[PDB]
mmCIF file of C-alpha atoms and ligand atoms in Angstrom:
data_model
loop_
_atom_site.group_PDB
_atom_site.id
_atom_site.type_symbol
_atom_site.label_atom_id
_atom_site.label_comp_id
_atom_site.label_asym_id
_atom_site.label_seq_id
_atom_site.Cartn_x
_atom_site.Cartn_y
_atom_site.Cartn_z
ATOM 1 C CA UNK A 1 13.030 19.870 -4.089
ATOM 2 C CA UNK A 2 10.010 17.511 -3.973
ATOM 3 C CA UNK A 3 10.426 14.238 -2.036
ATOM 4 C CA UNK A 4 11.467 10.964 -3.640
ATOM 5 C CA UNK A 5 13.448 7.761 -3.090
ATOM 6 C CA UNK A 6 16.829 8.926 -4.372
ATOM 7 C CA UNK A 7 20.087 9.638 -2.554
ATOM 8 C CA UNK A 8 19.260 13.313 -2.163
ATOM 9 C CA UNK A 9 15.530 13.325 -1.433
ATOM 10 C CA UNK A 10 14.874 9.823 -0.125
ATOM 11 C CA UNK A 11 13.338 8.587 3.166
ATOM 12 C CA UNK A 12 16.319 9.743 5.277
ATOM 13 C CA UNK A 13 15.552 13.343 4.212
ATOM 14 C CA UNK A 14 11.751 13.405 4.605
ATOM 15 C CA UNK A 15 11.978 14.522 8.215
ATOM 16 C CA UNK A 16 13.235 17.973 7.226
ATOM 17 C CA UNK A 17 9.955 18.838 5.471
ATOM 18 C CA UNK A 18 7.696 16.412 7.372
ATOM 19 C CA UNK A 19 8.688 16.353 11.069
ATOM 20 C CA UNK A 20 6.112 13.597 11.667
ATOM 21 C CA UNK A 21 8.621 11.229 9.973
ATOM 22 C CA UNK A 22 10.140 10.726 13.430
ATOM 23 C CA UNK A 23 6.748 10.251 15.046
ATOM 24 C CA UNK A 24 5.405 7.669 17.466
ATOM 25 C CA UNK A 25 3.361 5.521 15.053
ATOM 26 C CA UNK A 26 5.228 5.582 11.749
ATOM 27 C CA UNK A 27 5.089 2.812 9.176
ATOM 28 C CA UNK A 28 6.219 0.438 7.856
ATOM 29 C CA UNK A 29 7.537 -1.760 10.653
ATOM 30 C CA UNK A 30 9.144 -5.180 10.918
ATOM 31 C CA UNK A 31 6.662 -7.841 12.030
ATOM 32 C CA UNK A 32 8.357 -10.100 14.578
ATOM 33 C CA UNK A 33 6.126 -13.194 14.457
ATOM 34 C CA UNK A 34 7.423 -14.311 17.842
ATOM 35 C CA UNK A 35 6.337 -11.196 19.726
ATOM 36 C CA UNK A 36 3.098 -10.466 17.848
ATOM 37 C CA UNK A 37 0.163 -11.091 20.187
ATOM 38 C CA UNK A 38 -2.571 -13.524 19.098
ATOM 39 C CA UNK A 39 -5.795 -11.663 19.874
ATOM 40 C CA UNK A 40 -8.888 -13.928 20.184
ATOM 41 C CA UNK A 41 -11.281 -10.949 20.101
ATOM 42 C CA UNK A 42 -10.162 -9.943 16.606
ATOM 43 C CA UNK A 43 -13.045 -10.469 14.206
ATOM 44 C CA UNK A 44 -12.537 -11.992 10.745
ATOM 45 C CA UNK A 45 -12.080 -9.483 7.908
ATOM 46 C CA UNK A 46 -15.067 -8.742 5.690
ATOM 47 C CA UNK A 47 -13.970 -7.761 2.184
ATOM 48 C CA UNK A 48 -16.923 -6.860 -0.074
ATOM 49 C CA UNK A 49 -15.463 -5.974 -3.462
ATOM 50 C CA UNK A 50 -18.246 -7.425 -5.632
ATOM 51 C CA UNK A 51 -19.514 -3.963 -6.587
ATOM 52 C CA UNK A 52 -16.082 -2.356 -7.093
ATOM 53 C CA UNK A 53 -15.880 0.240 -9.857
ATOM 54 C CA UNK A 54 -12.337 0.958 -11.001
ATOM 55 C CA UNK A 55 -11.963 4.132 -13.016
ATOM 56 C CA UNK A 56 -8.413 5.042 -13.847
ATOM 57 C CA UNK A 57 -4.779 4.130 -13.535
ATOM 58 C CA UNK A 58 -2.103 6.784 -13.204
ATOM 59 C CA UNK A 59 1.600 7.256 -12.730
ATOM 60 C CA UNK A 60 2.090 9.975 -10.107
ATOM 61 C CA UNK A 61 5.884 9.781 -9.789
ATOM 62 C CA UNK A 62 6.560 7.605 -6.674
ATOM 63 C CA UNK A 63 4.180 4.827 -7.943
ATOM 64 C CA UNK A 64 1.077 3.877 -9.966
ATOM 65 C CA UNK A 65 -2.401 4.023 -8.485
ATOM 66 C CA UNK A 66 -5.545 2.358 -9.702
ATOM 67 C CA UNK A 67 -8.426 4.565 -8.527
ATOM 68 C CA UNK A 68 -11.970 3.485 -7.730
ATOM 69 C CA UNK A 69 -15.289 5.267 -7.497
ATOM 70 C CA UNK A 70 -15.812 5.853 -3.755
ATOM 71 C CA UNK A 71 -19.049 7.874 -4.068
ATOM 72 C CA UNK A 72 -21.032 5.021 -2.490
ATOM 73 C CA UNK A 73 -20.429 1.850 -0.485
ATOM 74 C CA UNK A 74 -19.409 -0.227 -3.537
ATOM 75 C CA UNK A 75 -16.142 -1.806 -2.409
ATOM 76 C CA UNK A 76 -15.795 -1.845 1.359
ATOM 77 C CA UNK A 77 -13.713 -3.329 4.158
ATOM 78 C CA UNK A 78 -15.249 -4.078 7.554
ATOM 79 C CA UNK A 79 -14.566 -6.458 10.397
ATOM 80 C CA UNK A 80 -11.135 -7.339 11.675
ATOM 81 C CA UNK A 81 -9.955 -4.598 14.105
ATOM 82 C CA UNK A 82 -12.126 -2.025 12.335
ATOM 83 C CA UNK A 83 -15.125 -0.111 13.554
ATOM 84 C CA UNK A 84 -17.400 1.146 10.819
ATOM 85 C CA UNK A 85 -17.272 0.896 7.052
ATOM 86 C CA UNK A 86 -14.151 1.749 5.037
ATOM 87 C CA UNK A 87 -14.385 2.459 1.282
ATOM 88 C CA UNK A 88 -11.686 1.445 -1.161
ATOM 89 C CA UNK A 89 -10.361 4.549 -2.872
ATOM 90 C CA UNK A 90 -7.174 3.216 -4.560
ATOM 91 C CA UNK A 91 -4.475 0.541 -4.569
ATOM 92 C CA UNK A 92 -0.755 0.763 -5.484
ATOM 93 C CA UNK A 93 2.472 -1.210 -5.086
ATOM 94 C CA UNK A 94 5.977 -0.662 -3.754
ATOM 95 C CA UNK A 95 8.716 -2.747 -5.362
ATOM 96 C CA UNK A 96 12.446 -3.141 -5.659
ATOM 97 C CA UNK A 97 15.219 -3.227 -8.219
ATOM 98 C CA UNK A 98 15.884 -6.864 -7.255
ATOM 99 C CA UNK A 99 13.568 -9.733 -6.184
ATOM 100 C CA UNK A 100 15.066 -9.711 -2.690
ATOM 101 C CA UNK A 101 13.721 -6.299 -1.825
ATOM 102 C CA UNK A 102 10.682 -4.202 -2.465
ATOM 103 C CA UNK A 103 8.195 -4.676 0.356
ATOM 104 C CA UNK A 104 7.812 -1.966 2.993
ATOM 105 C CA UNK A 105 6.810 -4.245 5.885
ATOM 106 C CA UNK A 106 9.094 -7.189 6.585
ATOM 107 C CA UNK A 107 8.328 -10.407 8.460
ATOM 108 C CA UNK A 108 11.137 -11.474 10.811
ATOM 109 C CA UNK A 109 13.383 -9.112 8.784
ATOM 110 C CA UNK A 110 12.491 -10.849 5.504
ATOM 111 C CA UNK A 111 11.767 -8.476 2.604
ATOM 112 C CA UNK A 112 9.482 -9.625 -0.207
ATOM 113 C CA UNK A 113 9.683 -8.581 -3.896
ATOM 114 C CA UNK A 114 6.864 -6.073 -3.583
ATOM 115 C CA UNK A 115 3.899 -5.019 -1.496
ATOM 116 C CA UNK A 116 0.332 -4.189 -2.528
ATOM 117 C CA UNK A 117 -1.556 -1.527 -0.573
ATOM 118 C CA UNK A 118 -5.348 -1.357 -0.872
ATOM 119 C CA UNK A 119 -6.303 2.001 0.620
ATOM 120 C CA UNK A 120 -9.679 2.583 2.301
ATOM 121 C CA UNK A 121 -11.126 5.520 4.228
ATOM 122 C CA UNK A 122 -13.615 5.615 7.091
ATOM 123 C CA UNK A 123 -17.065 6.614 5.820
ATOM 124 C CA UNK A 124 -18.037 8.313 9.075
ATOM 125 C CA UNK A 125 -15.747 11.196 8.073
ATOM 126 C CA UNK A 126 -17.574 12.080 4.850
ATOM 127 C CA UNK A 127 -14.526 12.486 2.599
ATOM 128 C CA UNK A 128 -10.901 11.277 2.475
ATOM 129 C CA UNK A 129 -9.630 14.743 3.254
ATOM 130 C CA UNK A 130 -11.311 14.713 6.665
ATOM 131 C CA UNK A 131 -10.434 11.041 7.177
ATOM 132 C CA UNK A 132 -6.664 11.690 7.026
ATOM 133 C CA UNK A 133 -7.040 14.126 9.955
ATOM 134 C CA UNK A 134 -8.249 11.336 12.285
ATOM 135 C CA UNK A 135 -6.361 8.555 14.134
ATOM 136 C CA UNK A 136 -8.695 5.933 12.617
ATOM 137 C CA UNK A 137 -9.339 7.650 9.280
ATOM 138 C CA UNK A 138 -7.708 5.033 7.048
ATOM 139 C CA UNK A 139 -7.373 1.271 6.780
ATOM 140 C CA UNK A 140 -4.751 -0.108 4.390
ATOM 141 C CA UNK A 141 -4.767 -3.782 3.475
ATOM 142 C CA UNK A 142 -1.180 -4.849 2.794
ATOM 143 C CA UNK A 143 -0.336 -7.916 0.710
ATOM 144 C CA UNK A 144 3.154 -9.254 0.033
ATOM 145 C CA UNK A 145 4.248 -10.394 -3.430
ATOM 146 C CA UNK A 146 6.884 -13.078 -3.905
ATOM 147 C CA UNK A 147 8.307 -14.187 -7.242
ATOM 148 C CA UNK A 148 7.046 -17.558 -8.407
ATOM 149 C CA UNK A 149 3.990 -18.350 -10.489
ATOM 150 C CA UNK A 150 2.113 -15.730 -12.474
ATOM 151 C CA UNK A 151 -0.963 -14.098 -10.958
ATOM 152 C CA UNK A 152 -3.699 -14.081 -13.667
ATOM 153 C CA UNK A 153 -5.605 -11.266 -11.979
ATOM 154 C CA UNK A 154 -2.553 -8.987 -12.095
ATOM 155 C CA UNK A 155 -1.930 -9.254 -15.843
ATOM 156 C CA UNK A 156 -4.563 -6.661 -16.797
ATOM 157 C CA UNK A 157 -2.538 -4.165 -14.702
ATOM 158 C CA UNK A 158 0.795 -5.234 -16.210
ATOM 159 C CA UNK A 159 -0.431 -4.849 -19.830
ATOM 160 C CA UNK A 160 -1.502 -1.234 -19.294
ATOM 161 C CA UNK A 161 1.767 0.028 -17.742
ATOM 162 C CA UNK A 162 3.169 0.989 -21.145
ATOM 163 C CA UNK A 163 0.567 3.722 -21.566
ATOM 164 C CA UNK A 164 1.453 5.339 -18.206
ATOM 165 C CA UNK A 165 5.230 5.028 -18.317
ATOM 166 C CA UNK A 166 5.991 8.574 -17.184
ATOM 167 C CA UNK A 167 4.866 10.863 -14.358
ATOM 168 C CA UNK A 168 1.465 12.450 -14.911
ATOM 169 C CA UNK A 169 0.218 9.901 -17.417
ATOM 170 C CA UNK A 170 -3.120 8.204 -16.807
ATOM 171 C CA UNK A 171 -5.317 5.733 -18.683
ATOM 172 C CA UNK A 172 -8.926 4.627 -18.341
ATOM 173 C CA UNK A 173 -9.059 1.443 -16.295
ATOM 174 C CA UNK A 174 -12.625 0.302 -15.882
ATOM 175 C CA UNK A 175 -14.018 -3.073 -14.918
ATOM 176 C CA UNK A 176 -10.971 -4.297 -13.007
ATOM 177 C CA UNK A 177 -11.853 -6.742 -10.224
ATOM 178 C CA UNK A 178 -9.620 -6.319 -7.140
ATOM 179 C CA UNK A 179 -10.750 -9.715 -5.801
ATOM 180 C CA UNK A 180 -8.251 -11.180 -8.247
ATOM 181 C CA UNK A 181 -5.357 -9.901 -6.119
ATOM 182 C CA UNK A 182 -6.324 -11.545 -2.831
ATOM 183 C CA UNK A 183 -4.524 -14.588 -1.381
ATOM 184 C CA UNK A 184 -6.625 -17.602 -0.271
ATOM 185 C CA UNK A 185 -6.463 -16.903 3.456
ATOM 186 C CA UNK A 186 -7.403 -13.648 5.120
ATOM 187 C CA UNK A 187 -5.336 -14.233 8.295
ATOM 188 C CA UNK A 188 -3.571 -11.027 9.272
ATOM 189 C CA UNK A 189 -1.456 -8.905 11.641
ATOM 190 C CA UNK A 190 -2.637 -5.424 12.625
ATOM 191 C CA UNK A 191 -1.125 -2.347 14.289
ATOM 192 C CA UNK A 192 -1.800 1.447 14.325
ATOM 193 C CA UNK A 193 0.521 3.302 11.951
ATOM 194 C CA UNK A 194 0.906 5.940 9.273
ATOM 195 C CA UNK A 195 1.033 6.629 5.525
ATOM 196 C CA UNK A 196 4.446 5.416 4.336
ATOM 197 C CA UNK A 197 4.956 8.411 2.028
ATOM 198 C CA UNK A 198 4.734 12.143 2.819
ATOM 199 C CA UNK A 199 2.787 13.705 4.432
ATOM 200 C CA UNK A 200 3.229 10.565 6.626
ATOM 201 C CA UNK A 201 0.009 11.194 8.566
ATOM 202 C CA UNK A 202 -0.557 8.842 11.506
ATOM 203 C CA UNK A 203 -4.103 7.938 10.553
ATOM 204 C CA UNK A 204 -3.799 4.321 9.460
ATOM 205 C CA UNK A 205 -4.908 1.014 10.877
ATOM 206 C CA UNK A 206 -2.631 -1.403 9.124
ATOM 207 C CA UNK A 207 -3.916 -4.874 8.246
ATOM 208 C CA UNK A 208 -1.100 -6.973 6.762
ATOM 209 C CA UNK A 209 -2.044 -10.393 5.359
ATOM 210 C CA UNK A 210 0.059 -13.383 6.380
ATOM 211 C CA UNK A 211 -0.210 -15.194 3.046
ATOM 212 C CA UNK A 212 1.663 -13.584 0.135
ATOM 213 C CA UNK A 213 0.463 -13.819 -3.435
ATOM 214 C CA UNK A 214 2.779 -15.104 -6.146
ATOM 215 C CA UNK A 215 3.649 -13.139 -9.275
ATOM 216 C CA UNK A 216 5.980 -14.146 -12.101
ATOM 217 C CA UNK A 217 9.398 -12.665 -12.735
ATOM 218 C CA UNK A 218 8.055 -11.237 -16.025
ATOM 219 C CA UNK A 219 5.184 -9.468 -14.225
ATOM 220 C CA UNK A 220 7.533 -7.842 -11.688
ATOM 221 C CA UNK A 221 9.955 -6.876 -14.473
ATOM 222 C CA UNK A 222 7.269 -4.717 -16.091
ATOM 223 C CA UNK A 223 6.777 -2.661 -12.884
ATOM 224 C CA UNK A 224 10.496 -1.915 -13.083
ATOM 225 C CA UNK A 225 10.224 -0.390 -16.558
ATOM 226 C CA UNK A 226 8.087 2.537 -15.320
ATOM 227 C CA UNK A 227 9.621 5.997 -14.880
ATOM 228 C CA UNK A 228 9.739 8.388 -11.921
ATOM 229 C CA UNK A 229 10.322 11.301 -14.332
ATOM 230 C CA UNK A 230 7.897 13.034 -16.679
ATOM 231 C CA UNK A 231 8.072 12.885 -20.472
ATOM 232 C CA UNK A 232 11.037 14.733 -21.934
ATOM 233 C CA UNK A 233 13.054 14.567 -18.701
ATOM 234 C CA UNK A 234 16.092 12.355 -17.958
ATOM 235 C CA UNK A 235 14.986 8.741 -17.469
ATOM 236 C CA UNK A 236 15.029 7.419 -13.896
ATOM 237 C CA UNK A 237 13.577 3.919 -13.571
ATOM 238 C CA UNK A 238 10.824 3.614 -10.947
ATOM 239 C CA UNK A 239 12.364 1.017 -8.621
ATOM 240 C CA UNK A 240 12.916 0.796 -4.886
ATOM 241 C CA UNK A 241 9.989 3.118 -4.094
ATOM 242 C CA UNK A 242 9.817 1.773 -0.539
ATOM 243 C CA UNK A 243 10.446 3.241 2.904
ATOM 244 C CA UNK A 244 12.629 1.229 5.281
ATOM 245 C CA UNK A 245 11.082 -0.214 8.467
ATOM 246 C CA UNK A 246 10.534 2.299 11.308
ATOM 247 C CA UNK A 247 10.920 1.812 15.107
ATOM 248 C CA UNK A 248 7.912 0.085 16.656
ATOM 249 C CA UNK A 249 8.136 2.306 19.777
ATOM 250 C CA UNK A 250 5.184 1.770 22.145
ATOM 251 C CA UNK A 251 2.991 -0.344 19.864
ATOM 252 C CA UNK A 252 1.868 -3.922 19.811
ATOM 253 C CA UNK A 253 1.322 -5.972 16.684
ATOM 254 C CA UNK A 254 -1.718 -8.198 17.047
ATOM 255 C CA UNK A 255 -2.331 -11.407 15.107
ATOM 256 C CA UNK A 256 -5.709 -12.835 14.119
ATOM 257 C CA UNK A 257 -4.249 -16.364 14.098
ATOM 258 C CA UNK A 258 -2.118 -18.632 16.284
HETATM 259 N N1 INW B 1 -13.065 8.617 -6.204
HETATM 260 S S1 INW B 1 -11.746 8.616 -7.292
HETATM 261 O O1 INW B 1 -11.374 7.357 -7.958
HETATM 262 O O2 INW B 1 -11.774 9.749 -8.308
HETATM 263 C C1 INW B 1 -10.135 8.898 -6.522
HETATM 264 C C2 INW B 1 -9.057 8.013 -6.667
HETATM 265 C C3 INW B 1 -7.801 8.267 -6.023
HETATM 266 C C4 INW B 1 -7.622 9.410 -5.230
HETATM 267 C C5 INW B 1 -6.314 9.697 -4.515
HETATM 268 O O3 INW B 1 -5.390 8.841 -4.684
HETATM 269 N N2 INW B 1 -6.127 10.897 -3.660
HETATM 270 C C6 INW B 1 -5.359 10.775 -2.421
HETATM 271 C C7 INW B 1 -5.481 11.724 -1.386
HETATM 272 C C8 INW B 1 -5.921 13.133 -1.741
HETATM 273 C C9 INW B 1 -6.061 14.145 -0.687
HETATM 274 C C10 INW B 1 -5.770 13.792 0.737
HETATM 275 F F1 INW B 1 -5.888 14.647 1.621
HETATM 276 C C11 INW B 1 -5.338 12.412 1.088
HETATM 277 C C12 INW B 1 -5.181 11.337 0.044
HETATM 278 F F2 INW B 1 -4.824 10.207 0.366
HETATM 279 C C13 INW B 1 -8.700 10.333 -5.073
HETATM 280 C C14 INW B 1 -9.957 10.111 -5.699
HETATM 281 N N1 INW B 2 2.424 3.143 0.773
HETATM 282 S S1 INW B 2 1.038 3.528 1.674
HETATM 283 O O1 INW B 2 -0.043 2.608 1.696
HETATM 284 O O2 INW B 2 1.285 4.009 3.066
HETATM 285 C C1 INW B 2 0.118 4.904 1.080
HETATM 286 C C2 INW B 2 -1.244 4.880 0.814
HETATM 287 C C3 INW B 2 -1.901 6.054 0.314
HETATM 288 C C4 INW B 2 -1.188 7.245 0.080
HETATM 289 C C5 INW B 2 -1.822 8.540 -0.484
HETATM 290 O O3 INW B 2 -3.063 8.514 -0.750
HETATM 291 N N2 INW B 2 -1.018 9.768 -0.723
HETATM 292 C C6 INW B 2 -1.654 11.013 -1.033
HETATM 293 C C7 INW B 2 -1.847 11.968 -0.031
HETATM 294 C C8 INW B 2 -1.908 13.419 -0.442
HETATM 295 C C9 INW B 2 -2.110 14.448 0.579
HETATM 296 C C10 INW B 2 -2.257 14.068 2.015
HETATM 297 F F1 INW B 2 -2.428 14.946 2.867
HETATM 298 C C11 INW B 2 -2.199 12.632 2.427
HETATM 299 C C12 INW B 2 -1.993 11.545 1.428
HETATM 300 F F2 INW B 2 -1.951 10.374 1.794
HETATM 301 C C13 INW B 2 0.200 7.265 0.363
HETATM 302 C C14 INW B 2 0.876 6.131 0.861
HETATM 303 HG HG1 HG B 3 -4.655 11.406 11.522
#
């Protein structure tokens, strides 16, 4: 049936319905800090989220997305390895059943507790639908989460999870400021890749931040209480919604710092 993260429909099965799963620029990948190339020509990232308008939060099976109004250049990402303006359309997380796993990308084989993905699309393409059909259509800002101190800016998200426990549920989520989820430093690694969930389109420029943000054990626990299933169906906890690292193949990971 539909794809998932279970034994019978997990990542190892996606290739049957989405041949691109065994493509040349699939994500996530393991970032080997010792072979990543420091690139002096990489420009600093420009994150302008001051005018961000969040609208809704929803459980879509797989994960929970916080959507933003992308009708105008309100929250945009520019700079770095990007050409043009990219609008923030939504952000979501991937997490594990235990603190030692959850992130999609790994650094020197180290998995973090979770990973935040802030998804943006290239404005030159007019709409996200056209953007996903281009090699530079999307830019996803990836941030690692490690268990430690609580992240104040994340609490508003944690408190609302109860109202969207099952698949298909959504709740109004206005006035959320995504700037509250950023680490202090904007140093990053970048490589061309793909969406990490079906349809696995190879249209993403990945920008993974070096500095993880810290979240408390209690905050991460609440992600784990969400459900993959819809209301009235057998309860399957939403945990381990991450795809294992894919072969790097003929790609080079560039670093904005030495
Ligand atoms: N402007 S808004 O807040 O209402 C909005 C928010 C989220 C999404 C979404 O997650 N769709 C994903 C999505 C839909 C179609 C497609 F081809 C690729 C793709 F990533 C769409 C619109
Ligand atoms: N974990 S991750 O950052 O890589 C990621 C980011 C966005 C999406 C998404 O928008 N899915 C909907 C969607 C629906 C239809 C389509 F054609 C493409 C598409 F991405 C999926 C995975
Ligand atoms: Hg593409």
